[PDB]
């Protein structure tokens, strides 16, 4: 629900405030690229990236590193 609310806020008031979208997407991306976080934090970070950045930011940022992220987090978690 918070992710949806943030997405709507960013889509609405992103022009009056110039740096809102870059800041939100950058923070979410920085937090996402950290295996030390638990699954909940990573889920929240990916959701925030998708909500704020938009389809283009997702496609151009998350896809290249998915192969590494898989072996990094999913496989260790898949064995649980």
């Amino acid at each position: 629900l918070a992710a949806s609310l943030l997405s709507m806020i960013a889509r609405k008031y992103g022009a009056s405030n110039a740096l809102l979208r870059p800041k939100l997407t950058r923070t979410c991306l920085k937090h996402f690229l950290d295996p030390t976080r638990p699954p909940a934090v990573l889920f929240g970070a990916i959701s925030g990236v998708a909500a704020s950045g938009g389809p283009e930011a997702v496609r151009v940022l998350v896809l290249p590193n998915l192969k590494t992220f898989d072996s990094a987090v999913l496989q260790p978690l898949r064995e649980k």
């Binding site: 920085k30 950290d34 295996p35 590494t68 990094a72």
Partner: peptide
């Protein structure tokens, strides 16, 4: 360590 540096470079 080895993972932390790799992920930091990836974020950069």
């Amino acid at each position: 360590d080895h993972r932390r540096a790799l992920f930091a470079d990836l974020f950069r």
